[PDB]
Every structure is written in structure tokens, then in C-alpha cells.
Design a binder for this molecule. Structure first.
Ligand SMILES: Nc1ncnc2c1ncn2[C@@H]1O[C@H](COP(=O)(O)OP(=O)(O)O)[C@@H](O)[C@H]1O[C@@H]1O[C@H](COP(=O)(O)O)[C@@H](O)[C@H]1O
Lengths: 523, 604, 414
């Protein structure tokens, strides 16, 4: 491997964006207003630093109002944000002015200082967490902003893959970002800088540990604005400056040398216990793992090795739909009568295990970000899903308890199918060519669950009290499914299995027609 | 002697090249010198703002894409992307090769006389010489490689010309060994092109006038030189940091996010760069290592180092005479060959972080070599050849004896042979997809695409498996969901193999495959280019009336003979009685049935 | 017709009787070798060794047309793809020679094919204490109780071919001097229910039971403890709640039980009752899904020799008490896709001789198996060849065979 935290910090520092953002923040602080201006084709929006405001209260994200966060998660741990920041954002009406002044822009950089930095981070979060991604790219660079957020909010941001757009510069001597309640959780990349260089940390746990050790450090300062100015001034000229980098005794190892250089760049010697603890934290920041770039290429071999299970499933489907009984492969698998059903169950279990392993590897961040953007992987996932989801539904309904009507679309759908659907959401617009014949497989993988729910509703309607209003309500709730099925059939987007003489769909249609004829409802 | 062993150029040749470059200042355009059996062409350097950045160019850097017809080999074989070169240098070269200059006639006469050709120059003009060398490599060497036809390119402080694609193309063709560039430790001319034009536009004319050796009487402005050096160093630092971050595969998400907000020069070193100092000579053969050394060497060490670095950088541009004269009194060391590079980099002034970055860049090449060795070992396995042997010698002959083409059998059947063939095809496709991904991720040596064995294996695999893939694609009715097979269904590996084979078979001639096809010839995303995709064309043409589409049928009939002759398709299996092609041709009306030219191949 | 008759003239009377038996056995079906050997053992009193010798001797001719028979790997293996089929002409032959006696029929009571009617020759003679050493009755929709009285004072072997869904059982076993073999075969596509199972408890002399595709009645204390039953083979049956209950001690009811086979049976998430039997000697579970882990009570059994676990997916891990078995000679696990690691102390099995782990996704072999001195044959995949040869280095007598994966579509036909 190779230590690159200091390399990432140097890359971030060398960009003109650092100096441009610092100048914009200084101008906004001097003028005391939100300054929007274009420099070198980049639109910088600097939020002035406000004060005489208390921090610490946590109320949570708004649920109803003009501002909303559709992209944020809404699980049991509710994400929370500082009440003061939200109140200031609502009062200042930043949204309207920003959307008015950002019309037609291509590159937008939001910046601020301390409370201004917190407001800029909140504005960037609001811009990114919307129904659709903004037409312009954003980059929230904060200069010593106070900690805001929560563990749930940080986890949701990491899951949403939005932490790459946030960068925070925290000095090794300031106390404002390091004085906060333990409920607060840092998010995004954090740059720790000093008169001899900087380091970058993109892990919440590593950033929290660094904050804790800096808190335990005796060296502290109260005046941080002049320190930040001096730090940025002396870091903007690091390119035209080569130092000895003696590092005491240079270790004869690439990783050890890199860690020692990173520790020395922070002004911490290799003699005090603080330096040793910093070295340990830096070492634990980066984990050892096989290179994702090689793993992505290697995944094709096991994909090919698991492909024979899909081939066996295809052959079983062909045999079932070519049989004399014409019960459909879904119903054939639903009724355990032959050893081929057991073999297909084994193949389905193997495929599910392989895809669960792949999904777990993806969520572990052991693969490149654009892994899910690959056309081959998306197409393979779609092919696997379109062939395996009906089998999983049939297995679940066969193993479903009689009185436990949890169904398949009411919290029992595996997360792998949801991730596959999210991947397929990026597929380009399909052609609207008219299909000459029925498709090989049903386009909708959730058709069978809806059919089972409709059958249950029809059975409940047939076997119940008179209640004419209840019958009317149940028919009203049922007929959307009938219309959807008719649309699918007329579009020839369903396989021949649903069109079989003895298939479940045909039986349900016959039962519905018999009920309508017996009882006489229109349509 | 090791300098002559590696570069292949003796000290006398270097001295003659330097003398010719010095003499070329008075002469116009180019100067030709005949020393013994050696012909040396020296290009006159030019010192003006328009000679570095093209006024007509609108981009932040004066870079324009090359022409495929002029430089067929200066592109990526797989991706198909062409290289980008400086606009002013390319225009100067085009003016040089103009027939009125009689340069082409002199070059032809020198080649016919069986004399070595040496291209030399100084400053920006020297960079032009590099382009000239490429021109030679695209006119005579590629037509018939030979020892006597080997050229020699020597430059003195030439600025960067090509981008990373240019360096990759040079490495793939094994032409990088003919370029030698001498750059001083503190030389600033090679670092000029690494900075954006907007940052140094104000101070470019003054620095360029000062750097001119013909008229050095101009008053020296220390402030302007200091600002120019500061801007150049800042831009070089940004470019080097981004390049070293991208090379190691770290902070990829952060780099991807920050790429849109950053504008960086795409120029990269190309050739064998040798660094000259007071008493040492170090030569580097890695572009990333060369860039890192170029950035790191021009750095200060203390206060005394400052306030004199810009002046030394300005003066060093005319200090190559001392290096040439005192060439034999300095030690020569090879950075790549040496195991311990700490002493060399310490002598050259590289800091510890520069040493670590250079070491990482060097280890990247070793990792690529190890990956190539692993790929070769995997390919040379017995089972990999056994699968292909089973496919070629068992499935196809049995299908032919069964009176049904193996494509049609794979389209619809229920036998164990089809299942085994599908399994083997899936395994081969997975292996080739892994290889294609490794090649795409730039984790393989540039010469890997140039291997004849790999090209032959890929061509055989394509010609043996592509009809099976087409049958699998059209069996599941996937053409009605996405579209034609050649539009959004063809795998990338087959396209890469076809492009590699076409380049290999057309490099001795000089034309791109598109020209040959179009010259031989609605045809958007057609199947007349690939013989192995012919079956897919049969899928597209069938089911349609003859009146609606007629030219495609004629093109297919014309290309069928060439495909049969070249072995792309086999007449025994694709002209079978039960083949779908025969049925489609039967459904064709009587007019084309009687006007078809392959009657002797169909009528019994 | 004449050729096989002449061959029968050259056969020994014992092998002639065996030939008649297998030939008159129901046709157009796959007959396991274990059932055939048990029938010969309890009919001719020739024991398993001579039964196998007779099978090998008769395998030369076409009367015992063999199949793939992959049982050649070892003698400790059970029965799998070892079925034997015979020709209908041979069946009619074996039905011909003195096999239609009106009243007595001292041996070979047969029925040519399933039908809702009974043979008129024996139907008329309702009161006939017939010697019935071999009885095979084929009946479809008609009641199992028949329309007459089979006293059968000297019967030894009984085989039944059955059908339909709702069915009863005959009272013949109640009026039975002795019986050793009882086989019930159902050919329906749905589970078949049985009524009146208390009559089958009259005789405890039965030694083999071959139930298949039926609703296994729940065990009750009123059932007479079968002190002679040794084999209980269930294939495609419906356990439902018969073996789930644990109130009644199965060991008391079946103290002589030694081999129990459960194949292609679902709804078997509970196995505590099966492990509760202390007389178990050879347990084999094949193609049984919906099993998470084996119960941690197998230490009660101290004489189990075989632990065949063919297929049986969704098995998270092997029990840690397996290593406590003193006489676990043979362990067979195949087609398992959920097993990831063997028990850490798996190498303490000093009685282990042969192990099969074909098509098993094992992660890492523990070092304990380096102490498996008695281990001789290992049949596994190519992936585990390295860490099996690492054991073979310690024990030269260890033999490792790589099982190639053959791709066939014969499973689709069934
Ligand atoms: N409609 C589709 N459905 C499902 N898969 C598709 C579809 N279209 C293309 N592919 C597959 O998508 C991959 C793109 O990788 P590609 O290297 O180009 O990635 P990019 O460079 O572009 O990022 C190729 O392997 C295509 O393979 C073709 O599909 C058949 C079935 O494949 P099967 O063997 O899995 O059954 C094969 O016969 C090949 O005709």
C-alpha cells in the first residue's frame, strides 16, 4: 500500500480554490453579507460569520414546510441538525437568493467561516439532498466551523455518497470545532493543518479520535482567526518551498516513512506520547485490504462460475413451460413434486448467496465507486433478477404461514433486489419499439406478489358478509390491478407462463369474471 | 559507456548535434549537415508568444487533436481516442513539410543513400524535431522496419509536446528508445507548458525575450521573472500532485469530485529524459517519474537558495555548451536500473517526499509487469486451450454432421452439448472480460496490446465464440428490449479484439480500417465490417420486406466472399440446408434469387 | 419365451426362486437394491452376503439390467442410483410356472397389474389358509381390505402397490402368524392419506418397513413395540407431526431399529426425536430442506456408524458434538452450499475411514484432521486437493480422488 492522507491534503491545498475561498470568506466577513461573485469562471458564495448565537440544541430535520430533505433517511434513528443553524437559515432566506443568483451557473462553491461555515454546510446539504441532483456541482469548504449533525445524519450522508462534496479545515490549536457535545458527529473530509503542513482524514471515527486526542493535548490557543489567516498564507506558498523532512531516523519502509512524515507535518515529534498516539491513529485510519481495482476484474471469474445455476434455471423454465400440464414454472415451483424443483431451489440459493456476497462487498467500499455504473454489471444483475425474483416469491409463499399474511411487498423483499433496482434506475431510456411476440421473461418482477394479493382480496370479497359498500370498496381497490394486468398483456411485456391455460393468472381472471357475472357489478 | 549502451548515441554525435543546433540559429527553417555517413537536421528555434500558444486556440492550453490519416498509429487501439499535440508546434511542422521547402526530397534522398537520420534542435524548435521524428516513424520505419532505417532524436531542453495518450502510443510501438532529451536541473523552458496561459500571459513576452540568446541586451526585470517562476512552479506542483494521486489509486472519490473544478495541463513527458547536474548524469525512462523529478528538482533549500533561483533558471537555458563539452567527465547512472536511488536523488536535490513518490512510480511499473506475467501464465494454462479445442473440434463437427448449423443449434436445442458449450462460452467470456477490465484500468504494460500471441488468441476466441454469443443474445429475445445487437449489445472485448487485429494487419500499409471499408463499399451500425457478426446481420435483415431494404443485402453479398476467403465464416456450416440464412434467402423474391452472385455456392 | 425358460432350467433352485421373485416384482419402476436384498434375506434366509453374491451372479444376464451404479467407490456407501429393472416378458414368465393355484398357491402370490378388481381364482376361495411366502398385491382405487380373507399361516414377505389420495389399510396383518417385510408404494402426484393404522400394530415380527409418499401416522403408546423392526426408509413421505412429537419414546417402540432414511421430505425442522433413539446405527438424510442445524443431543447415540448428509441445503454448521461419536466410521456430505467450515475437533474421530465432501464450499480445513490415521479414501473437489494432500503427506495410506463435474440433463426428465 501507500500512505496518501498527507498527499490528499497537499493536493487539496495546491488548488487555487483554497485561496479563492479564503478571500471570499474574508470579504464576506468584512462586508457582513452573503457575497456571490465569479472568479476564474467559478461562482463563489461566501456566507458571513454570525455570532451571539447559542449552539447545542438538537431538534431534527423539518418534516413539513418549504424546506425538505427527500434524500435523507427516515429510519428509526432520525437524523438531527442544530436548531440554531436551521433557524438562521430560515430567517436569512438564503434559499431564495441562492436560487435566484445561481441561474445558469455551472460551478458553485459555497464557503463560510465558523457559523458562516456551518450555514454554508447546511446550504450545501439542502442543495444536494433534493428530489433531483442540482444542475450545478457544489463544494462546501468550511474554515473551522463548529460541529453540527448526529450519528444518524452522518450515516445517512455516508450511505447517500455525499460526503465527498464537503471539506472542513480545522487547525491543530483552535478549540471552537473541538468543544461540542458527544452527540455531535463529524461528517465529510477533515483537513488538520499546521505551520509545517496538513493531513486529510475521510473517516468519521478517525476524525473523532483525532478530536479526542487534541482535546487531551495540553497545547491550546484562544485566538484562532489570525492563526487561520497565517496558516492559509503559509500553506498557499508551500509549492515554492522544499524542506529537509529529516524525521529523525528515517524508517526503511514505505508505509512507516509515510506515517512518520505525516506525523512530522503536524508539528508533533516522535518522542512525546502524543506523537506515538497520533502515529497509531494515522496507522489505524487506513485499513489493509485487497486492491478494489483488481477485485472488480477478478469478480468476472466467480460470476462465470455461478452462471451455470442461471443456465439450469433457464432450462428448467423451458421444460416447465414446454410441458403438457401448462401450469407455468411459477406454479410448478410452488408445488413441490419433483426432484428438479429441489435442484432449482439449490441453484437459486447459490445465486442468492453469491449476489448477497457481492452486495455486501459493494456496501463495504471494497470496490470502486463506478462499479454500479458499469453496463455489464447492471445488465447481469437485471438478467439474474428477472429470472430469480419469481422463484423467490414462490418459495416465500410456499413457506408462508397460513395466518401470517406478510406478503412479498410489505417488508419481506430482500435488500439485494432493492439495490439491483437502484442500479437499474440508471439504465438509459428503452426504445418504444412494438414487440412482435411475448417476451421471454416478465418485465415486472413483482407481478406475482401483486397477483397473490389480488387473489387474496378477491377471496375475501367472495367469502364475507353482504355489505354492498364493502364489495364496492374492494372492487374499487381491485380494478387497478386488473387494468395494469390488461395493459401488460396488451403490451406483450409478459411471458407465456402467465398466459397458460391452467396458470394462476387465468384462474384468477376466470374467478373474477364469474364473480362479476354472478353479482352484476358494472365494468 | 553505459550512456551509449542505453541511449545508443555516442558523445561525438551529441557534440555534432549541438553544433548543428547552434548553427541553425542563423539559418532559416531547417539546416542540413552531412558528417561522415550521418545526416543531421537542425530546426531553428523561435522565441515569441505566438510560437508557444496559438492565438486561434480557445482552450486554456494550446492543444489540438491529431489527424488519423496523418498519424494512424498515434491513437489508442482499443478506446480509439486520438492524441493531442501543441497547435503552434504542429503548424510549424506542417509548414516545414511543405513541398516548397524541399525537406521531403532531402529526406527521401538521405533515406535512399542508406544513411542514419538524426533530428536535433534547441528550445521550442527542438520540440518540433520530436514531431518530425514521429513523421519519419509514420512514413518509412513503419513501412519496412530495419536497422539501417532506425532514426535518432536528440533534443536540448525541449518543452513538452504530447499528452499521456502520445506517450502510451510511443510506448506501444516500441519507439520511445529513439528519443533523448537533455534537460538542466534548473531549466525552466520544459516547465513553461505545464502552466495555464491565463496565469502567465502577462509575463510570457518578457521572459521569452530574455531567454532569447540572439538578443540578450534587453533589460532584466527581476520582479517579472520571479512572478513567472512562481506561477509556473505553482501550476507544476498542482499537476504533479494530481498525477501522483491518480497514479496510486488513492482518494479516487475526492479526485473525481475535484476534477470538474480543476483545469490542469494534459501534457506529459515522452521519451528518455536525462537530467544534467554539476558532476552527475541521471537518465529516467518512466514518464511519471520524469514528471516528478522535473517538478521536485527545481526547488529551494534555504534563504540563500532563494533570490537567485529564477536568475539561475534563466541562465541555465544557454549552459548546454558546458555540459556537451564536459560530457565525458561526469558519472552516468540509470535510475530504473539502480536498486538504491536515495543517493542519486539526494545529490540531485530531491526531497524525501519526492523520493517516496518516485519510488511509488517505479514500483507501479513492476506491479504492471507482475500483472502481465500473471495474465500470461493464466492464458498459457492447459484447460484454457482444452476448452477452445473442445469447442472447435467437437461441437462444430457434430453440428455440421447433424445437418444444422451450430449457431442454429445453440439458438434452440435441448441436448447436453448445448449446455456444455454455453458453460464453456460463459467461462471464456468471464476470463476475457477480466482481461479487458485489467487493460481498461491501465494496469497493464503498453506493449501488451502489441503482443502477436495475444492478438492471435483474441482473434481465434472471437471467431470461435462470437456466433454463439449472438445466438444467445437473439434466443432470449433481448433484441426487442434494448435494440440491435450491434447498437447496444455487442461486448466491448470483441470490438477491442477486432480493432487490434485490424491495426496489426493494416499497420504495414498505412490506412485506417474505416478507409478500407468505406473504400470497398443507411450503413449506420451495420454488420458489413465484421465477418463474425454476419449472423447478427441475418437477424436484422430477416423479417423485413425486400423493397424497404436492398442496399444492405447487396453489401452483405459482396462482403460474404471476402469473409469466406479470410476465414471469418465457414461455408460448410453457414450455407447448410437447415441454416436460417438459407431459409431467409429462400423467402427472398425471385429477382434477387436469380441475380445473386453466389449461385454456385447454393444451388445443388 | 423358450430361451429364458431353458436358462431357468440351468439355474439353482434358490437362484431360480430369487429370479422368479424379482421378475414377478412390479415392473416399470426403479427398485432400490437395499429393498431387494432385504426381501431375499427375509425370504430365502440367505443373509446379506449370499444375497449380494446372488445379485452379482445374476447381473451377468439381462434379467438384472444394471444402471450407472456409482457404489464402486467403497463398501461402506449406501444405495444411490443402483436401481435394477426387468423385462415384462420375464415378469410374465415368472408368473407362468405353477403360479396360478386356485386355493393353495404355496408361494408367489402375485397380481399382474393394478386394477379395482381381485383375481377370481383366489377371490372365490375366500376361506383358504394359503401358504404365502411371497405376496405382492397391486390395487388402485379399490379398498385395501379386499373382499375375502387372506389367513396366510406361513407368509413371510408382503409388498403392496398403491395409488390415489384417500386410502385405508387391510385387516390382513391382524390375522397373520408372522410377517417380516411390508412395503407400501404410492404413485400419486399428491400426498396420500392412510386410515386405520392400528391394525398394523398386531404383529411385531416385521423387520423392514418401506413407506413412501404418504401421511405417516403419529406414533402412539397403544402401538405394540416392534422389537424386530430394523429398517425404516421414508422417501417423499409426509412426516407432518408423527416424528415432531417427543412425548412417546421412540426407542421403546422401536428398540431394534438400526437404519433410518429420510429422503425428499420437507417440514422437518425438528430432529430431536430422531436423535433421541439410542439404537440408531446408520442415519441418512437426503434432499431435506428447511433444516437450520442438527440438534445438540446426538451424544445419546453411541453406536452410529454412518452420517450421510446428501444435499440438505441451508445447513449453517455441523454440530460440535459430532466429534464425540466413538464409532463414526463413515461421514458423507454432498451438494451442501451453506456449510463453510468443519468442526474444529473433527480430527479426533479415530474410527473415521472414508469421508466425502464433493461440491462443498469449504473455506479452510482445520489442522485436527491431520490426526485422522484411520482415514483412507477422500472424494472431494479440486479446490480442496491441496489441503487434502497436506494430510496425505502425514498419512501415506490416504488416497484422494478428484470428482469431475458432469453436466447432464437427466434430472429434468424426472
Ligand atoms: N439486453 C441485455 N441483457 C443482458 N445483458 C446484456 C444485454 N445487452 C448486453 N448485455 C451484456 O452486457 C455486457 C456489456 O459489457 P461491456 O463490456 O460492453 O461493458 P461497457 O464497456 O459497455 O461498460 C456484455 O457481456 C453483453 O453481453 C451480451 O448479452 C448476451 C447475454 O449475456 P450472458 O452471457 O450473461 O447471458 C450475451 O450473449 C452478449 O451478446
Amino acid at each position: 500500500r501507500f500512505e496518501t492522507s498527507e498527499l490528499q491534503a497537499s493536493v487539496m491545498i495546491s488548488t487555487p480554490l483554497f485561496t479563492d475561498s479564503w478571500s471570499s470568506c474574508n470579504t464576506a466577513n468584512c462586508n457582513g453579507s452573503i457575497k456571490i461573485h465569479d472568479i476564474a469562471g467559478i461562482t463563489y458564495v461566501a456566507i458571513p460569520a454570525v455570532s451571539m448565537i447559542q449552539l447545542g440544541n438538537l431538534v431534527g430535520l423539518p418534516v413539513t414546510g418549504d424546506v425538505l430533505f427527500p434524500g435523507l433517511s427516515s429510519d428509526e434513528p432520525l437524523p438531527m441538525v442544530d436548531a440554531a443553524i436551521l433557524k438562521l437559515f430560515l430567517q436569512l432566506k438564503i434559499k431564495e437568493g441562492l436560487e435566484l443568483e445561481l441561474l445558469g451557473k455551472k460551478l458553485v462553491v459555497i464557503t463560510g467561516h465558523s457559523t458562516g461555515g456551518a450555514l454554508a454546510a447546511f446550504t450545501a446539504l439542502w442543495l444536494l439532498s433534493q428530489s433531483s441532483p442540482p444542475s450545478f456541482r457544489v463544494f462546501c469548504i468550511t474554515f473551522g466551523s463548529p460541529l453540527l449533525g448526529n450519528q444518524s445524519l452522518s450515516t445517512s450522508i455516508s450511505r447517500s455518497r455525499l460526503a465527498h462534496n464537503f471539506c472542513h479545515v480545522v487547525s491543530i490549536h483552535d478549540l471552537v470545532p473541538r468543544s461540542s457535545n458527544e452527540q455531535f458527529w463529524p461528517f465529510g473530509t477533515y483537513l488538520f493543518c499546521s505551520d509545517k503542513g496538513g493531513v486529510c482524514l475521510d473517516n468519521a471515527g478517525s476524525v473523532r479520535l483525532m478530536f479526542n486526542i487534541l482535546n487531551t493535548t495540553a497545547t491550546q490557543n484562544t485566538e484562532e482567526h489570525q492563526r487561520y489567516g497565517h496558516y492559509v498564507f503559509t500553506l498557499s506558498h508551500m509549492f515554492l518551498k522544499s524542506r529537509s523532512f529529516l524525521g529523525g531516523s528515517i524508517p526503511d519502509n514505505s508505509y512507516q516513512a509515510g506515517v512518520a512524515l505525516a506525523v512530522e507535518a503536524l508539528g508533533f515529534s516522535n518522542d512525546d506520547t502524543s506523537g506515538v498516539l497520533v502515529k497509531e491513529c494515522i496507522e489505524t485510519a487506513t485499513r489493509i485490504v485487497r486492491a478494489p481495482i483488481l477485485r472488480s476484474a477478478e469478480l468476472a471469474n466467480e460470476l462465470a462460475s455461478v452462471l451455470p445455476a442461471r443456465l439450469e434455471i433457464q432450462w428448467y423454465k423451458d421444460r416447465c413451460d414446454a410441458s403438457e400440464e401448462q401450469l407455468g414454472y411459477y406454479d410448478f415451483f410452488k408445488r413441490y413434486s419433483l426432484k428438479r424443483d429441489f435442484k432449482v431451489n439449490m441453484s437459486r440459493i447459490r445465486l442468492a448467496k453469491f449476489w448477497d456476497t457481492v452486495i455486501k462487498m459493494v456496501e463495504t467500499n471494497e470496490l470502486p465507486f463506478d462499479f454500479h455504473l458499469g453496463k455489464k454489471w447492471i445488465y447481469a444483475s437485471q438478467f439474474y433478477q428477472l429470472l430469480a425474483e419469481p422463484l423467490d416469491i414462490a418459495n416465500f409463499y410456499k413457506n408462508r404461514d397460513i395466518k401470517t399474511g406478510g406478503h412479498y411487498l410489505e417488508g419481506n423483499r430482500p435488500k439485494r433486489y432493492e439495490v439491483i433496482d437502484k442500479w437499474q434506475k440508471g439504465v438509459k431510456v428503452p426504445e418504444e419499439c412494438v414487440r412482435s411476440r411475448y417476451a421471454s421473461t416478465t418485465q415486472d418482477t413483482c407481478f406475482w406478489a401483486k397477483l397473490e394479493q389480488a387473489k387474496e382480496w378477491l377471496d375475501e370479497a367472495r367469502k364475507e358478509s353482504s355489505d354492498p359498500q364493502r364489495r364496492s370498496l374492494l372492487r374499487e381497490k381491485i380494478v387497478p390491478f386488473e387494468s395494469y394486468a390488461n395493459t401488460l398483456v396488451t403490451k406483450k411485456e409478459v411471458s407465456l407462463d402467465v398466459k397458460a391455460k391452467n396458470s394462476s393468472y387465468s384462474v384468477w381472471e376466470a374467478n373474477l369474471k364469474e364473480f362479476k357475472c354472478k353479482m352484476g357489478y358494472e365494468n | 559507456m553505459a550512456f551509449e549502451a542505453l541511449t545508443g548515441i555516442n558523445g561525438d554525435l551529441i557534440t555534432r548535434s549541438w553544433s548543428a543546433s547552434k548553427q541553425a540559429y542563423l539559418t532559416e527553417r531547417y539546416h542540413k549537415e552531412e558528417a561522415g555517413a550521418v545526416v543531421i537536421f537542425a530546426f531553428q528555434p523561435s522565441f515569441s508568444e505566438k510560437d508557444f500558444f496559438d492565438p486561434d486556440n480557445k482552450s486554456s492550453f494550446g492543444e489540438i487533436k491529431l489527424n488519423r490519416v496523418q498519424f494512424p498509429c498515434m491513437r489508442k487501439i482499443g478506446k480509439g481516442d486520438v492524441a493531442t499535440v501543441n497547435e503552434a508546434f504542429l503548424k510549424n511542422l506542417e509548414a516545414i513539410i511543405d513541398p516548397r521547402t524541399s525537406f521531403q526530397a532531402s529526406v527521401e534522398m538521405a533515406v535512399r543513400s542508406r544513411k542514419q537520420i538524426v533530428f536535433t534542435g534547441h528550445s521550442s524548435g527542438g520540440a518540433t524535431a520530436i514531431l518530425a521524428t514521429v513523421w519519419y516513424l509514420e512514413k518509412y520505419f513503419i513501412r519496412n522496419p530495419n536497422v539501417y532505417l532506425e532514426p535518432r532524436c536528440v533534443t536540448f531542453g525541449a518543452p513538452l509536446v504530447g499528452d499521456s495518450i502520445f506517450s502510451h502510443a510511443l510506448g506501444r510501438e516500441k519507439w520511445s528508445r529513439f528519443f533523448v532529451n537533455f534537460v538542466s536541473r534548473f531549466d525552466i523552458v520544459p516547465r513553461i507548458m505545464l502552466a495555464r496561459k491565463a496565469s502567465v500571459e502577462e509575463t510570457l513576452p518578457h521572459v521569452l525575450a530574455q531567454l532569447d540568446p540572439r538578443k540578450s541586451s534587453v533589460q532584466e526585470s527581476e520582479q517579472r521573472i520571479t512572478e513567472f517562476y512562481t506561477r509556473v512552479m505553482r501550476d507544476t506542483s498542482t499537476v504533479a500532485n494530481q498525477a501522483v494521486c491518480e497514479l496510486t489509486g488513492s482518494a479516487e472519490a475526492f479526485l473525481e469530485t475535484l476534477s470538474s473544478f480543476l483545469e490542469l495541463s494534459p501534457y506529459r513527458p515522452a521519451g528518455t529524459f536525462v537530467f544534467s547536474t554539476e558532476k552527475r548524469l541521471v537518465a529516467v525512462n518512466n514518464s511519471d517519474a520524469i514528471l516528478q523529478m522535473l517538478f521536485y528538482t527545481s526547488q529551494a533549500s534555504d534563504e540563500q537558495e532563494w533570490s537567485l533561483i529564477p536568475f539561475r533558471s534563466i541562465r541555465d537555458h544557454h549552459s548546454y555548451e558546458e555540459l556537451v563539452q564536459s560530457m565525458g567527465k561526469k558519472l552516468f547512472n540509470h535510475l530504473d536500473g539502480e536498486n538504491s536511488i536515495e543517493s542519486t536523488l539526494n545529490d540531485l536535490g530531491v526531497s524525501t517526499r519526492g523520493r517516496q513518490y518516485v519510488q511509488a512510480a517505479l514500483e507501479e511499473e513492476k506491479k504492471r509487469v507482475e500483472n502481465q506475467k500473471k495474465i500470461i501464465q493464466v492464458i498459457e494454462q492447459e484447460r484454457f486451450l482444452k476448452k477452445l479445442a473442445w469447442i472447435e473440434d467437437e461441437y462444430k463437427p457434430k453440428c455440421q454432421a447433424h445437418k444444422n448449423g451450430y449457431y442454429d443449434s445453440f439458438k434452440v436445442s435441448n441436448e447436453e452439448n448445448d449446455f456444455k458449450a454455453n458453460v464453456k462460452r460463459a467461462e471464456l467470456a468471464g476470463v476475457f472480460d477480466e482481461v479487458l477490465g485489467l487493460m481498461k484500468k491501465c494496469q497493464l504494460p503498453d506493449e501488451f496490446e502489441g503482443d502477436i500471441d495475444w492478438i492471435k488468441l483474441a482473434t481465434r476466441y472471437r471467431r470461435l465464440v462470437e456466433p454463439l454469443d449472438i445466438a444467445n443474445y437473439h434466443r432470449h429475445l433481448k433484441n426487442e428490449d434494448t435494440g440491435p445487437y450491434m447498437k447496444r449489445g455487442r461486448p466491448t472485448r470483441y470490438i477491442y479484439a477486432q480493432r487490434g487485429y485490424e491495426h496489426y494487419i493494416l499497420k504495414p500499409n498505412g490506412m485506417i480500417a474505416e478507409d478500407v471499408f468505406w473504400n470497398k463499399v443507411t450503413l449506420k451500425n451495420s454488420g458489413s465490417e465484421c465477418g463474425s457478426c454476419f449472423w447478427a446481420e441475418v437477424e436484422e435483415l430477416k423479417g423485413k420486406p425486400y423493397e424497404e431494404v436492398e442496399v444492405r443485402v447487396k453489401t452483405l453479398e459482396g462482403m460474404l466472399g471476402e469473409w469466406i476467403t479470410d476465414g471469418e465464416v465457414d461455408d460448410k456450416e453457414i450455407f447448410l440446408e437447415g441454416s436460417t440464412f438459407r431459409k431467409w434467402w429462400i423467402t427472398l423474391p425471385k429477382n434477387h434469387k436469380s441475380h445473386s452472385p453466389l449461385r454456385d455456392y447454393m444451388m445443388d | 419365451f423358450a430361451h429364458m425358460e431353458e436358462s431357468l432350467e440351468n439355474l439353482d433352485p434358490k437362484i431360480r426362486d430369487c429370479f422368479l421373485d424379482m421378475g414377478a416384482f412390479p415392473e416399470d419402476k426403479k427398485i432400490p437394491l437395499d429393498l431387494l436384498t432385504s426381501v431375499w434375506v427375509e425370504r430365502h434366509d440367505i443373509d446379506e452376503e449370499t444375497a449380494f453374491s446372488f445379485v452379482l451372479r445374476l447381473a451377468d444376464k439381462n434379467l438384472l439390467t444394471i444402471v450407472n451404479n456409482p457404489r464402486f467407490g467403497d463398501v461402506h456407501i449406501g444405495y444411490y442410483d443402483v436401481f435394477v429393472t426387468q423385462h415384462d416378458v420375464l415378469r410374465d414368465l415368472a408368473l407362468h410356472m405353477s403360479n396360478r393355484v386356485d386355493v393353495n398357491r404355496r408361494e408367489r402370490l402375485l397380481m399382474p397389474k393394478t386394477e379395482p378388481v381381485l383375481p377370481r381364482e383366489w377371490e372365490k376361495n375366500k376361506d383358504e389358509p394359503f401358504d404365502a411366502k411371497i405376496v405382492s398385491l397391486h390395487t388402485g382405487e379399490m379398498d385395501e381390505m379386499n373382499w375375502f380373507d387372506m389367513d396366510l399361516p406361513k407368509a413371510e414377505v408382503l409388498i403392496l402397490n398403491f395409488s390415489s389420495d384417500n386410502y385405508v389399510l387391510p385387516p390382513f396383518i391382524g390375522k397373520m402368524s408372522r410377517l417380516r417385510v411390508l412395503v407400501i408404494i404410492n404413485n400419486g402426484m399428491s400426498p396420500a392419506r392412510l386410515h386405520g393404522f392400528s391394525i398394523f400394530a398386531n404383529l411385531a415380527k416385521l423387520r423392514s418397513l418401506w413407506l413412501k409418499r404418504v401421511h405417516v401416522p403419529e406414533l402412539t403408546s397403544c402401538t405394540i413395540p416392534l422389537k424386530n423392526l430394523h429398517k425404516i426408509h421414508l422417501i417423499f413421505c409426509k412426516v407432518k407431526n408423527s416424528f415432531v412429537q417427543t412425548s412417546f419414546d421412540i426407542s421403546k417402540i422401536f428398540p431394534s431399529l438400526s437404519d433410518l432414511t429420510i429422503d425428499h421430505c420437507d417440514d422437518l425442522l425438528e430432529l430431536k426425536s430422531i436423535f433421541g433413539i439410542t439404537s440408531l446405527n446408520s442415519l441418512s438424510i437426503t434432499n431435506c430442506p428447511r433444516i437450520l442445524e442438527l440438534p445438540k443431543n446426538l451424544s445419546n447415540v453411541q453406536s452410529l456408524e454412518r452420517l450421510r448428509l446428501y444435499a440438505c441445503p441451508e445447513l449453517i454448521s455441523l454440530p460440535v458434538e459430532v466429534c464425540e461419536l466413538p464409532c463414526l466410521k463413515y461421514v458423507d456430505i454432498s451438494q451442501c452450499v451453506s456449510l463453510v467450515s468443519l468442526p474444529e475437533k473433527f480430527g479426533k474421530l479415530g474410527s473415521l475411514e472414508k469421508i466425502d465432501m464433493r461440491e462443498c464450499s469449504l473455506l479452510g480445513l482445520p489442522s485436527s484432521v491431520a490426526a485422522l490415521v484411520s482415514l483412507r479414501h477422500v472424494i472431494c473437489d479440486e479446490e480442496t486437493s491441496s489441503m487434502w494432500e497436506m494430510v496425505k503427506k502425514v498419512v501415506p495410506e490416504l488416497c484422494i480422488e478428484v470428482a469431475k463435474k458432469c453436466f447432464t440433463v437427466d434430472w429434468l426428465d424426472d
